[model samples]
Every structure is written in C-alpha cells, then in structure tokens.
Target chain A: MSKIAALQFPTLALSESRLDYYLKASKDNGVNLVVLGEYVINSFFTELLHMPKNMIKEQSEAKKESLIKLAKKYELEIIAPYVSVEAKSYKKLCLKVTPNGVKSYEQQILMPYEHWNEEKFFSNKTPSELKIFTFNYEKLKCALLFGFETHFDIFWQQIMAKKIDLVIVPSACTFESKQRWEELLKTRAFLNSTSILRVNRIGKTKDEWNFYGDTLFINAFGEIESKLGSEEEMLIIEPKKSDEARKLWGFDKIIKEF
Target chain B: MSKIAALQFPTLALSESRLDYYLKASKDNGVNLVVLGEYVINSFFTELLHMPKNMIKEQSEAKKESLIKLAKKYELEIIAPYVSVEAKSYKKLCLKVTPNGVKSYEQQILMPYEHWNEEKFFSNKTPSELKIFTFNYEKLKCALLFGFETHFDIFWQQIMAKKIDLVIVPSACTFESKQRWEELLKTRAFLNSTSILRVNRIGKTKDEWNFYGDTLFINAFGEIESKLGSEEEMLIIEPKKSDEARKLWGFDKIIKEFKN
Candidate 1:
C-alpha cells in the first residue's frame, strides 16, 4: 500500500534545484520513498576518470550534504547511487538517505568489459555485507542492489533466501540493451517471486555511453506493471507484496527440499 | 554448420509410420539431428499411474526397438524422451538413438508440485552422471536436459563449465506457461551465451493437462531464431555456434576468476 517513486531523469551537474522539484512532487503525491538512477548526483564513471581527484571529492561531498538536508526537509527516504571518494581512493556506492542519517552499500560486481571498465577504475573491495543490502519498509522486505549485480544468480539466491518482498535496482544501462535488460530483470523477479523496481539513468555520457532511461516496475509474475519512456519522467508505483506469489509458485519450497 | 530438427507432435498410439515421415523429411531437409517432446513414446506421468506397470514397460520397449530400427534405416540421430521400467522401479529418461547404439540420460529435478507430482510417483534414484549429458555434433558441443531442470542455475553453471554451444531441452509444457518458459529459456541463452533448441509437446492428456507446443529455437543472443505454432509441426533451425557471443559478453571469463 506504500507508494515508491522511481525518478528517471538525465545525469546533469550536481544541482539540488532540479532534484528538489522531483522530491517535492513525490512528497506531494504521497511518496515517502524515492529512488534516483545511478550516477545522478555524481558524474559518470568515464567522465570521472579524467577529472581532478579533489574536484571529484568535492562534488561527492557536496551532493551528500545536499541530499541529507533535502531528505530531512522532505521527510522522504531516498536511495541514490554515486561515487564516494576517500583520501586517495574512490568507490562506487548506493547511499540510503533518511531523516535520521545515511547508510552506504558499496557496489560490487563492476563491469569488466573493455568499453566500460569500472573494475579497473574504481578502488572497490570485497563488500562487507556480501553486497546484499536489505531493509524493512512499511512491512515490505526490500533490498537495494547495484545495476550490474542483477545479472548474476548468486545475488538472487540471497534474495530468495531472505524472502525479500521487493528489490530496487539502480542502473546506468545503455548501448541498446533495453530488451536484454528487461528480459533479465523480469526473469529474475519471476524466478525469485519478488517485485522489482529498476531505475535506469537517461541521457548520454560525455563519451559514447548513451544511458537510455527505461525505468520500469515488474510484479512477481514477471509482468511489467508500469514503465517509463526514454524521457525525463518520474514513475510512481505501488508494488504488491510478494507473499501471495511466493505461495502460489512454490519455487522456493523446492530449494528447501533439495 | 549442422542442422537440428525439433519435431512437435501430439501424443498418440506409438506408430512408426508417422515418425518415419518426419525423420525422412528432416533428412531430406539436411537435418542430421532430431529431438522430440517428453512423454511422446510413453504415456504422460499422470496417465502412467493408472496404467499397469507391465503395460508401461512393454510400451517403452516397443518404442525403443522401433526407434532403433528407424534410426538405422534413416541414418539419422534421434533424441527421444520416454520412460524406462526395470522390475518394480521405473525412471524417466532421454535416450539418444544413433545408427550405432543408444545412450540414456536420466531425468533429474523432477516437478514436486501438487498437481504435477513426478517425484513421489516415479521410482527415481540419484543420477549417476550428475544428470548432465553432452555429445559432440560436428564442431559444436551439445548437451541434453529435461524440462524442469531449466529453472535452476546449477544446471546452467555446468553448461557454462562445459562450454556447450547448443542445449536441447525436451519438455511437455502445459497450463498456459509459454510466455514464462520463453522468457526463462531466452534469459538462460542470453546469460550463458549458448543456443537452445526447446521442443514442447502438443495436444491434451486424458486428465486436465493440455500441452501447448511452442517449439522454438533461440540463438546465443537470446533472439528467437524460428518458432512453430500451437499445432503440431516440425521446426528446423541451424543454430550459430556460440564462440562470438561468449567472446563478446565475457561472462564465463568472470567465473574462472572466482574459482582461481
């Protein structure tokens, strides 16, 4: 019964004015939970490699402060994926901002491809939480995962074991792989019997990566509930709890029998 | 460069004439390998429970002999899924009948649902070969798997390790689950970078089960190469080898890093 909004907009400079409008609108629409796409607050990975380390650090710190203040002001729980720069090392992370404070989940399973090589660039380590971030929201067992991690089955096994009700993924998908991404995410939700809210970033990088926004929400049955176009729009959906689907499918019950 | 034929037909009395027609047609069309749906030679699992054990055994033996004769006559390699009974125990198997002889792969990961209770009915045992059956065809390495095993990642991991280029799954799918099966199989091919030739049965059982044949072939990129209608038909597809997709996606490369 709770409303969660997926704010799919372009990756622009770190400015709170545009973000404030979307957060305020979501609050007005009775959305206490809002999630932004990957690299929305911070710059894209390819663009960050060339920037000065101090400038990149300042940008992340500024975005963190602005999001903390705005989260408390709007009284909304926001999940944003950005870069976190420590002294000389920087890692990709997804931060959960609430009125109380902020919690971070480091991004694991970086893209190791030649075209988009986040593995060689980011100074990521083995995740402390096994890369599985879970929280409780309005009686719904929700998990937040990075984009590339959704492709693997190891992560889905943990979600099934935990009996997660909903999964929120923040991705920077591009290169006309929309159909593949949709199929992959839908199949995961279908097999795991969990609702998925996938938020993909819109617009292109300064280089060749074109992040087309096809943010969507799929039900436990692998059916698309609602989806957004390749434009800057916010999609608000009330994801159904997954208890009924899990009981009906009984896929997880077979795991225990095994 | 090899052609595979997926023969989608209704469950009827075991007749060699109809099968010979399809097999000869597949040979004429340059298809050396062929696959059939589950429970085609033997009765459906639910129907088998009511029938006498001796009758099921006789039916399986007769079908095996007929398939062997036909395989040698046509000089075609056939992959057929049927039941095998030995004394008081029976197990479901997929047999690859060639001109030389026959090889069997037992069905694992049986459906344990309420309406479809294959686990309790069949006298199945722990598979001796880990339920993975692989054979080389031309330059491509192929694997054979039953229907329900496609849902798990454990089987896909094995397929990736073997670097199988094409996977043949023989299923008797029903209950309007075509879309889910298609999505699941496509995702499997997409993730594993392997081509899949899925053959489903057609027509209804004596009970409430109605098998809808959506026999199709999907390439390594998860694109549907060819498909058949709900009606009975044979689909022939020349699956491209998965060498290029594997090199491009590089998913299997990450697996070795983990193990190392």
Candidate 2:
C-alpha cells in the first residue's frame, strides 16, 4: 500500500519554522505522498492586495525553492499548488516533488479572467496538474483540485478525456457554504479512478476569507471514509491495491486506458 | 446580415407568466434564435432534495406544451433545455425544443451518480446531442450547448475535429463561486469555437445556492466584446458581418447543404 498524507491547515504566513514543523511531522508519520493547499505558504492579505500583480513570478520562484528543500529533507512526494511567476505568458504553475527531490511541473491551460475583475486579482496561468503519474508500484491517474462553489460538472467534462487518479483541492472552503461542493465530490467519485483529498485552511484572514478546517479523505465513489475536524491535522492515506474502488464506484464504464 | 440572440435566464419558480414573458420578449426583439438555461421551466430544488429523484418525465411533458405554445405564438426558433422523461432510466432523459418543439431528445451519457445515492438519477445514453447544429444562414455554422459537466472536450474533438464556430453556455452559475466554473468556460473557449456566450443566473436561492449572472458575449478570438450585469438586463449582440462569427456563429455554415 502506498501511504499518502494530506495536510490541511490555515495559510500560515510563510515561515521557516512552520515549514520545519510540517517536514518533521511527515518524517514522524512515514508519509510517502503529501499535498499542500494553494497559497498555503504565502500571506493571503499581501498576495490579495499589497503584492504587485507582476511580482508573482519573483515571489513564486523563492517559494518553490523552499518547498523543494522540504521535499528532499522529508523524502516525501509533494504536490504543491503555487503561483508560477516565471511561467510562459498564460500559464499557471503547479509543482510535483518526487521522493528523490526530482521536481515535475505542469501549467493550467484555462485561467479564469472574470475573477480578476471580481477579486481585483490575477494569476499568470491556470494550472493543469491533473495528468496521471506512474509511481513505482502503480500508475497514478489524473487529479483535479476544486474550491468552494467549483463546478465539478464542467471540470468533469473538460478533462473527461484524460486519465486522472487524484484531485487535490487547497481550499479555504467550508462545508456550510453550499451543497454543490458535496455534490461535485460525489460525482467525481462516481465517474473515474479518482480520489479527492482536501487540505482546507482554518481560521479567518483578511477580506473575511474564512477557511473551515474540515479536511477530508474521500474515495472516487464519493464515500467519505475519514474526516478531520476544525483543529489542525495531518493524515496519511494509502492507495488501494485491488480494483475494489473501480468496482465500487462503477467507474469501469468511464475509466479509459491511459 | 442575420442577427442572433441567445437569452439565458433562471427558472426560479417555473410559471406560465415567466415562460410567456420570455416568449414575448423573443418575438418582440425579432430574435431569430433563443436558448433557455437548463431546467428553465422547472425548479429542480424539490426533486433534488426529495425521494424517488425523478423529475425529467414530469418536467418534459409540461415544458413540451410550453415550448409548442411559445413557438407557435412567436413563429420563432427557441431551443429550450428540459429533462428527458421518455428515458426508461433517469440518465437518458434529455430533450431539446426546436421552433416546432421536441425536435430530438437524447440521453445525458455522463450522469453524475453521486448526486443520487441509491436512486439512479439518470440513464446511460449515447452522446448524440454533442453534435453541432446549423441554422439557415451561411456564416453561422452551428451552436453547441453543454448542460452536464462530463468529458466534453473529447466529445467536441470527435465531432468538430478541431473546427467549430460557436459555443453557448446557459449556466446557472455565479461569480463568488469556485474557479472550476470559470475555468471550464475559458478552456472551452480556448480549445474550440471562435465565440462563446455564457448566460448564467444572478440571484439568491434557497440552500445558499447563488446563481452567477456573469453573462459574457465573446468573439472568435476569445475576447470579450460585451458583458451583462447579474441583474435583469438585455443585450443585443450584432456580430460583425466581416468577422469570423458570421461564418461560425450562425446557421450560415450549413445553410447551403440544407437549401440545395
């Protein structure tokens, strides 16, 4: 069994101490794979307001180096969602850290322009990290990350052709916000070889962006096997070896050959 | 030059007055073609929360009458989204309303089963409606509607083969929501089609379900020419005759074959 751990915590303003704590915890738990939420290390207020829109490139590079160091020290596979400042125009950057500290990156093809108008913010690219990766024991399929109020139906159709296995959502989302989020999770479970791991932030930030700490580990069939409360928590989940998930979720119909 | 109007609105209560108002508006505006949001004539809330989880059949019969009446009254072409009740199972029941009403109905192949626990919400049907349809004009090749959030990119690739004119999304989404909704719209615009019109709902509903009223009218190159507020508003979009929209956004692309 490939043990995977997902970290869900409030966006701790980037600090060496916080990074050190997470790295220590992963070593203690023997986690093989881990994921951090989007913008987990940065100051939410600064990025949302004070930071120059063009400066995301410079800032993201600095953060990537720090994350790479953590991955190497812990000997863990990390999928970190971060802003890509140096990516080619019109690409959002996401980084994948392997056990050997070998880093792989993907770019998001579609960027939501309307959000810049609503939040007065912009990211250089939409990150496309859902492509499946082959691990030592098994092949990891495509993964999708969603936020609160994210339309799963649209994302389901958009990447339906690709073979995906996991969807990592780094959300300041809440369970009370909307029923659609739950509905979306269930749909993804039913359709493909996917599992949803949400690392939600806890506590309030600037702009009243409240992050609910109800982190979850859900199977492809929308079954919530485990959940963590509002307190900070870390969990290591192992990918199932049998085809039980595929059979249980009835994903045989939609599970195309990669 | 032929003008096209794609009207997207919410189906809050789904009453006769609302249906009549939409029909009258389309006629008065000389709108050649009009499209309604999914389940525009019925509220899926009660069924969504209740048992037996079957509303498509009942809504289909009711909307059929409404579409027939509206089409005759306006003498116009109206494409309306309705649940396909004729489907023996839940997933198979999706139908479209033409100017004459009920032109063709197909199953929604990619049904989100997680929405319905034990109760099968939809049937497994073939993906036929994924094909683009053309109007009578030469420049307007076809318009495609995506209601469910299934694997549509692959579907589009097989049908359009990297060539498409326009994509119309009548979504009941909101701005305060997640990036997936907007990302889906942007991705579709980038992959295919020169023009994309996303008509969404802009109001508060029960269950904290807010509809995004970010109605965008975009060009072939994926640039926004105009946008409507989340409030009740009407936009008359006249595609430039010299632009690609004339060839891609309307019935004009397939008009010659039908006429001959």
Best by the DockQ measure: 1
Considering the two chains of model 1, state its CAPRI-style docking category. Answer: acceptable
lDDT for each candidate structure: 0.86, 0.53
lDDT of 2 by residue, A1-258 (tens): 456677776555434566668767776776667777655655453344566656655566666777778777776667766654444342334467665655544432232234322123434332233333223424555454535223323345433435345666655564455243454454555455466777666667655656667777777655666677777778777655324665554444443421
Among all candidates shown, the one with the greatest lDDT: 1
Q: What's the iRMSD of model 2?
A: 13.5
The alpha-carbon RMSD over the true interface for every model, in angstroms, is 4.2, 13.5
How well does chain A score by TM in each candidate? 0.96, 0.74
For residues B97-210, could you state the per-residue lDDT of candidate 1 as single tens digits? 999999888777788777788887776775544546789998889999888888777678788889999999999898578778888999999888999999988877777677
Best candidate according to TM-score: 1
Model 1: per-residue Cα lDDT over A37-64, one tens digit each: 9988877878887999898888988988
By summed lDDT, the worst window of 10 consecutive residues in model 2 chain A runs over A110-119
**Which segments of model 2 are wrong by more than 4 Å?**
A13-15, A45-48, A52-66, A84-92, A102-139, A142-163, A174-178, A245-258, B1-260
